[PDB]
Amino acid sequence: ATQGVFTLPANTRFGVTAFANSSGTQTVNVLVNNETAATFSGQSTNNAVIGTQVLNSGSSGKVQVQVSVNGRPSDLVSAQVILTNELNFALVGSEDGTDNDYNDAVVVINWPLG
Amino acid sequence: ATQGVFTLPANTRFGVTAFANSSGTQTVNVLVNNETAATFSGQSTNNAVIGTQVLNSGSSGKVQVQVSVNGRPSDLVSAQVILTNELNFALVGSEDGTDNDYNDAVVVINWPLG
Amino acid sequence: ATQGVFTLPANTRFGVTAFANSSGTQTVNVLVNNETAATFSGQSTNNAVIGTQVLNSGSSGKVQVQVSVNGRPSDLVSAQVILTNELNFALVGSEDGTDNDYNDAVVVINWPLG
Amino acid sequence: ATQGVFTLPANTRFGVTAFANSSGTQTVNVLVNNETAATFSGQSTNNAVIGTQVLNSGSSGKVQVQVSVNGRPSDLVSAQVILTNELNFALVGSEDGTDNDYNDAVVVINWPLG
Ligand SMILES: C[C@@H]1O[C@@H](O)[C@@H](O)[C@H](O)[C@@H]1O
Ligand SMILES: C[C@@H]1O[C@@H](O)[C@@H](O)[C@H](O)[C@@H]1O
Ligand SMILES: C[C@@H]1O[C@@H](O)[C@@H](O)[C@H](O)[C@@H]1O
Ligand SMILES: C[C@@H]1O[C@@H](O)[C@@H](O)[C@H](O)[C@@H]1O
Ligand SMILES: [Ca+2]
Ligand SMILES: [Ca+2]
Ligand SMILES: [Ca+2]
Ligand SMILES: [Ca+2]
Ligand SMILES: [Ca+2]
Ligand SMILES: [Ca+2]
Ligand SMILES: [Ca+2]
Ligand SMILES: [Ca+2]
Numbered sequence: 001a002t003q004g005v006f007t008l009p010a011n012t013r014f015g016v017t018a019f020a021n022s023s024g025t026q027t028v029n030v031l032v033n034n035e036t037a038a039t040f041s042g043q044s045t046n047n048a049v050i051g052t053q054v055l056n057s058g059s060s061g062k063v064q065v066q067v068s069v070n071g072r073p074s075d076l077v078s079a080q081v082i083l084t085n086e087l088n089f090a091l092v093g094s095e096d097g098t099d100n101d102y103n104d105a106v107v108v109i110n111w112p113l114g
Numbered sequence: 115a116t117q118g119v120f121t122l123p124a125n126t127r128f129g130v131t132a133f134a135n136s137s138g139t140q141t142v143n144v145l146v147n148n149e150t151a152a153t154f155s156g157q158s159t160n161n162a163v164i165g166t167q168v169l170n171s172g173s174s175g176k177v178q179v180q181v182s183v184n185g186r187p188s189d190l191v192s193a194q195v196i197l198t199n200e201l202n203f204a205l206v207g208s209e210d211g212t213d214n215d216y217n218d219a220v221v222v223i224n225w226p227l228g
Numbered sequence: 229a230t231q232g233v234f235t236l237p238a239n240t241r242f243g244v245t246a247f248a249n250s251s252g253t254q255t256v257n258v259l260v261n262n263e264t265a266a267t268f269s270g271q272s273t274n275n276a277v278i279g280t281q282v283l284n285s286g287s288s289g290k291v292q293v294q295v296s297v298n299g300r301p302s303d304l305v306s307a308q309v310i311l312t313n314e315l316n317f318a319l320v321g322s323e324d325g326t327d328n329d330y331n332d333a334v335v336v337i338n339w340p341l342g
Numbered sequence: 343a344t345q346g347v348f349t350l351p352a353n354t355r356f357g358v359t360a361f362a363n364s365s366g367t368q369t370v371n372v373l374v375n376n377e378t379a380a381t382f383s384g385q386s387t388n389n390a391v392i393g394t395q396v397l398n399s400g401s402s403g404k405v406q407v408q409v410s411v412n413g414r415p416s417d418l419v420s421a422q423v424i425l426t427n428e429l430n431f432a433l434v435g436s437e438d439g440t441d442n443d444y445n446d447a448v449v450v451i452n453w454p455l456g
Contacts, residue, residue, distance in 0.1 A: 001418075087207040115305040277391065331455065
């Protein structure tokens with residue numbers, strides 16, 4: 001099934017934050033309405049926050065996360081969780097190798113902000 | 115129901131990261147086995163990261179997040195989500211006022227690392 | 229924070245299913261637009277499906293679950309999870325005593341159907 | 343990523359319940375320790391419960407859900423959610439066709455019981 005694609009409230013600010021846990025340098029791309037809106041990169045095996053940014057979901061609300069290492073797309077896993085019918089987290093894990101820890105780049109999207 | 119309390123696997127490193135979305139200064143305390151292990155403080159209405167750290171869950175695996183604003187405890191909401199039976203997120207929102215956006219401090223705990 | 233309240237897309241069929249795990253007889257009421265639309269009762273310590281039903285969210289999309297034991301309201305916990313940006317689960321646990329297993333009545337709402 | 347595989351606490355009773363939402367007959371196999379422990383089947387486009395059972399996670403705690411329709415395994419999506427650090431849901435959706443509603447068989451695993 002498609003992973004890393006989320007429908008957010010239209011025209012709404014959201015936070016996107018990426019963490020690295022791999023020997024490989026991670027590159028995380030965030031697409032809003034199918035166009036790159038943010039790119040983060042780094043290399044850590046200790047959960048470095050390689051990027052954090054506030055974006056707007058735009059007219060369509062479509063947000064997609066992609067992750068690659070050495071130009072090869074990582075396999076993604078994702079889900080969205082809503083607390084007290086209001087607080088939202090869109091979650092992404094990714095795997096760049098063979099151990100299946102899926103933490104090589106971890107991405108958290110949160111809204112609402114403010 | 116109690117919120118903000120999570121049982122992690124014993125002796126496991128985890129990341130904890132806090133974001134702020136409120137006019138009030140947020141104080142986030144992270145307890146491991148009932149003792150303070152990290153404290154973050156900051157003010158933002160733009161989802162700023164007010165702290166990030168890597169901790170060890172210790173022998174008990176018990177991790178608790180508490181949030182207060184100028185000494186007043188915030189009401190919390192939380193849940194844990196596991197993707198592909200491997201990647202864990204323990205999520206906390208908090209409310210310091212009357213609007214019930216529950217994002218006034220947002221805390222994300224993730225494991226495994228590495 | 230408020231628990232057991234979910235906003236579904238309007239005029240949408242959804243499933244609601246209740247399970248019992250307690251010495252006490254559980255009464256589960258499912259409200260749509262603040263009016264009871266389904267009720268289930270029963271006792272089990274072995275997860276009996278005390279009821280399942282297909283309901284329509286109606287014009288408001290507001291769905292609330294309430295649980296009581298011989299008229300005494302149980303404490304609720306809840307969250308919503310979305311898989312592959314399309315499959316929704318609204319989840320409720322409830323506690324009628326002191327042990328905090330929160331499984332005394334468990335309610336699962338799922339959509340879309342068909 | 344692997345989906346529909348969950349590690350439960352060892353020797354723990356859990357509920358498993360399946361719903362159908364498709365033109366095709368769903369066969370759901372529930373494996374414990376890599377051996378079939380339960381099989382449910384049925385056809386519904388109205389979320390009928392096609393099976394429910396209490397099982398034991400056994401010494402390894404490994405539980406897997408597989409879904410087949412028209413002689414072929416369906417594509418699965420899954421996640422585990424934990425409420426108030428106590429109540430566990432392991433959730434599975436499945437797609438037997440081309441519409442990507444992922445509800446064709448929906449499987450809910452819950453623990454603890456009792
Ligand atoms: C240090 C290692 O680097 C990679 O090979 C990752 O895929 C592993 O998960 C681990 O983080
Ligand atoms: C700017 C405002 O500050 C507080 O009153 C918060 O409780 C509100 O949610 C909002 O963030
Ligand atoms: C048999 C017991 O019945 C009640 O006291 C429940 O609150 C307990 O969780 C347990 O199920
Ligand atoms: C009635 C239809 O039956 C199948 O084709 C399913 O894959 C569809 O999702 C729909 O439920
Ligand atoms: Ca890896
Ligand atoms: Ca890794
Ligand atoms: Ca607030
Ligand atoms: Ca706020
Ligand atoms: Ca109880
Ligand atoms: Ca119980
Ligand atoms: Ca389908
Ligand atoms: Ca279907």
